[PDB]
Amino acid sequence: MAFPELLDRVGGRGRFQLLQAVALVTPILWVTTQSMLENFSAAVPHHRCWVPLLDNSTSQASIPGDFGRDVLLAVSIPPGPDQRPHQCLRFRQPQWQLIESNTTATNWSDADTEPCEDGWVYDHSTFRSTIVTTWDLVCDSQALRPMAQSIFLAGILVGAAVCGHASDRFGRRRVLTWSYLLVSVSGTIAALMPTFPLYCLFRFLVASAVAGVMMNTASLLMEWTSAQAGPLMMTLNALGFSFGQVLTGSVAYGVRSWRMLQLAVSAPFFLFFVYSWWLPESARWLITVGRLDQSLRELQRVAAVNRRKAEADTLTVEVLRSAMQEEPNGNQAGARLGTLLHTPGLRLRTFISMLCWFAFGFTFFGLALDLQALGSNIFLLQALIGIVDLPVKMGSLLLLSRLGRRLCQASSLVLPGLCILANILVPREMGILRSSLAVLGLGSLGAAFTCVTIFSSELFPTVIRMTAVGLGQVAARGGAILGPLVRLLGVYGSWLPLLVYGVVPVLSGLAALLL
């Protein structure tokens, strides 16, 4: 009297699971928007130093001679490496001699300049306001954007662990509902904080609650369906993220103020919390705990939804108790973690799987948060990453059965990897080729997440299936944290952030051939 018999009795495929899939895949879009909002709410616009001659109208009325703004800009700001007015320093004493062309304007000492003690002036053509504009994340404070992104990712990790324990102890639907509420409230609060550390802390809390939402949605979606229909709903969950990227691009185009954007993104989660109550709790977990009457209630409700009351009429507590007894025990938790690495055969298999899990977080999140440097129109780039993800993800699974198993993993990492390395070599003059390659790079890098998830289970023995995936997700989260921090190497050179992000997938993909 195992649970699958009962689930087949009530109805495994019809109606109810479709509605549940809709109601649980809709929030994934807004989860993706919350995750990728940092690309728009923290965009760094073009800026230059504050100059009394230009910015101040009181000094504007005192200008001797009607000189054009370009001449004043050349006078007051030293030239920069890219022929632009240099960003982080200013002329002390209005240099009039620069007007004359008789002197080669190249002999300038570092003692002739001062740091911008009077703030900056930013460009407001595209973005009305970001966090960089508000709190002056410029010059000496340019290292605090990857800090914010790493704090958010660490929040995801800690929230995943804590919510895992809490959902294993209390249930699925309850933790999911309270996670919806926490996301909404924490986002609404974060949209109003005046100082940077408060913003970082509330983004941390939002990330924790988001991790809880994703985990509980995945588990509750898996536990209510027959084993034949698992990968189909995994594919639906995967497509949710691509539609979420498209939605992120659209909403970012709609609103161009970071506080309003954050409020608009964090608003619907309260609505999700409101109707999260009507969902039924997973019957398998209810059977495991020992509250049989609640299990019978959920089973009868979901059977009545599918119009299968006649088969539900025969359900009694005895078969539920038999299913309780048949459920395997998990006392072995302390044992499988060591056995994964202590086994000589399993030591190498895990590590290469670990390295493949590591490479996804390091490369994808290090680049998907820096679309400003890969092109001009970041509204269009966000849409295309979601668009290209659809044909590639579905088109890849065809090659699984035909081209084999071990070859798919190697191609799923090398080929997106070489797209990024080609971005360095190609001249910046051909911008269209630069942008199209980056779309195909990160667009095809998402297919690695799906292929590895499916392949992880089949290799390992049935005993250690769950624990093997548990390690794999940890390296993805731990690797993603180190992603943004690499951008701090950009001071040495422009090509260094791209070089490291391209070498890791090539080594990860080629090393997977030993599996």
Ligand X SMILES: CCc1nc2ccccn2c1C(=O)c1cc(Br)c(O)c(C#N)c1
Torsion of CA 95, 100, 106, 111, to 10 degrees: -20
Nearer to ligand X, 280 or 361 (CB): 361
Q: Taking the complex as a whole, how short is the minimal distance between the CB of residue 262 and ligand X, in angstroms?
A: 16
Q: Taking the complex as a whole, how short is the minimal distance between the CB of residue 337 and ligand X, in angstroms?
A: 19
For residue 121, give the 3-state DSSP assignment: strand
Applying CB under 6 A, which of residues 361, 416, 417, 443 lies at the interface with ligand X? 361
Q: Taking the complex as a whole, how short is the minimal distance between the CB of residue 481 and ligand X, in angstroms?
A: 9
Applying CB under 6 A, which of residues 10, 25, 148, 214 lies at the interface with ligand X? 214
Site for ligand X in 236-265 (CB under 6 A): 241
Letters for 96-135 (x = contact with ligand X by CB under 6 A, - = none) are ----------------------------------------
Number of residues that bind ligand X (CB under 6 A): 13
Amino acid at 431: G
Q: Taking the complex as a whole, how short is the minimal distance between the CB of residue 34 and ligand X, in angstroms?
A: 8
Q: Taking the complex as a whole, how short is the minimal distance between the CB of residue 450 and ligand X, in angstroms?
A: 10
Nearer to ligand X, 78 or 386 (CB): 386
For residue 8, the Cα-to-chain-centroid distance in whole angstroms is 36
Q: Taking the complex as a whole, how short is the minimal distance between the CB of residue 233 and ligand X, in angstroms?
A: 15
Q: Taking the complex as a whole, how short is the minimal distance between the CB of residue 378 and ligand X, in angstroms?
A: 15
Nearer to ligand X, 7 or 221 (CB): 221
Q: What is the Cα–Cα distance from 248 to 386, expressed in whole angstroms?
A: 9
Torsions phi, psi for 79 (to 5 deg):
-70, 155
The 8 Å CB, 24+ separation contacts for 342-350 are 346/460, 348/514, 349/459, 349/460, 349/515, 350/468, 350/471
Q: What is the Cα–Cα distance from 190 to 203, expressed in whole angstroms?
A: 7
Q: What is the Cα–Cα distance from 427 to 436, expressed in whole angstroms?
A: 14
The 8 Å CB, 24+ separation contacts for 327-331 are 327/3, 327/287, 327/288
Applying CB under 6 A, which of residues 473, 488, 495, 503 lies at the interface with ligand X? 473
Q: Taking the complex as a whole, how short is the minimal distance between the CB of residue 477 and ligand X, in angstroms?
A: 4
Q: What is the Cα–Cα distance from 245 to 29, expressed in whole angstroms?
A: 7
**476 counts as binding ligand X under rule CB under 6 A:** yes
DSSP structure string for 247-304: HHHHHHHH--BHHHHHHHHHTHHHHHHHHGGGSPPPHHHHHHHT-HHHHHHHHHHHHH
Applying CB under 6 A, which of residues 159, 171, 417, 446 lies at the interface with ligand X? 446
Site for ligand X in 18-57 (CB under 6 A): 32, 35-36
Letters for 215-234 (x = contact with ligand X by CB under 6 A, - = none) are x-------------------
Q: What is the Cα–Cα distance from 79 to 112, expressed in whole angstroms?
A: 13
Site for ligand X in 144-173 (CB under 6 A): 160
**505 counts as binding ligand X under rule CB under 6 A:** no
**456 counts as binding ligand X under rule CB under 6 A:** no
Q: What is the Cα–Cα distance from 383 to 39, expressed in whole angstroms?
A: 13
Q: Taking the complex as a whole, how short is the minimal distance between the CB of residue 389 and ligand X, in angstroms?
A: 8
Nearer to ligand X, 407 or 485 (CB): 485
Residues that bind ligand X (CB under 6 A): 32, 35-36, 160, 214-215, 241, 361, 446, 473, 476-477, 480
